């Protein structure tokens, strides 16, 4: 789902075994966190075009998810991949997608 | 930009030198293709949550309406990263998003 997914996956080529792969996971935490915080705006080999946002300290969810929402340390990230990924989604889970 | 970004940046810890990362680039082509195509629905260790949006629509009625009719190889990958990436976006994009 997460560590199983890409520590296994990418170890197939790079990350060959436990030591290389384990670096990779702890190294993508470092790939972005530098970017998102200051350098957020990015494109990553047709795999990750990062474009995030805040919305400051409004703090006041609603009248339901008790005094909350995710608003005081920014808001989230909005990202677009494609090209490679794009051609992929074409034909394999897709006939359930247009009907 | 694409190659220079990943190869150097992520090589700092994992991807030691050209051999290591270089596998990781040609392999990220092989990381998604499987998923995006059929398994598109996915989360990437709190980095990349994939979810496709198929949209071409065109079977092939005849050389007339425009060879098409109904549903086709359709897609552009839509992705939302997670609280870890935007946890970093609580700093500097956090700020000037404001206006």
Structural notes for this entry:
Chains A, B: Keywords: DNA-binding, Repressor, Transcription, Transcription regulation. Two copies of one chain form a homodimer. Chain A has one domain (1-99): HU Protein, Chain A (Irregular), CATH 4.10.520.10. Chain A contains four helices and two strands. Chain A has helices at 3-11, 18-39, 84-89, 95-98; strands at 49-53, 76-80. In chain A, helix 1 packs across helix 2. Chain A starts with a helix and ends with a helix. Chains A and B meet through helix 1, helix 2, strand 1, strand 2 and helix 3 of A and helix 1, helix 2, strand 1, strand 2 and strand 3 of B.
List the defining traits of the structure above.
two-stranded antiparallel sheet; extended; DNA-binding (chains A, B); IHF-like_DNA-bd_dom_sf (chains A, B); repressor (chains A, B); 99 residues; DNA binding (chains A, B); 2 strands; 10% strand; transcription regulation (chains A, B); mainly alpha; homodimer
Task: Indicate the overall shape of chain A.
Answer: extended
Question: Which percent range describes the beta-strand content of chain A?
Answer: 5-15%
Output the CATH homologous superfamily of chain A: IHF-like DNA-binding proteins
Domain module tally of chain A: 1
- The name CATH uses for the topology of chain A is HU Protein, Chain A
At the first level of CATH, what is the class of chain A?
A: Few Secondary Structures
**Quaternary organization:** homodimer
SSE succession of chain A? HHEEHH
Q: How many beta strands in the DSSP annotation of chain A?
A: 2
Largest sheet of chain A: 2 strands, antiparallel
Integer-rounded radius of gyration of chain A: 18 Å
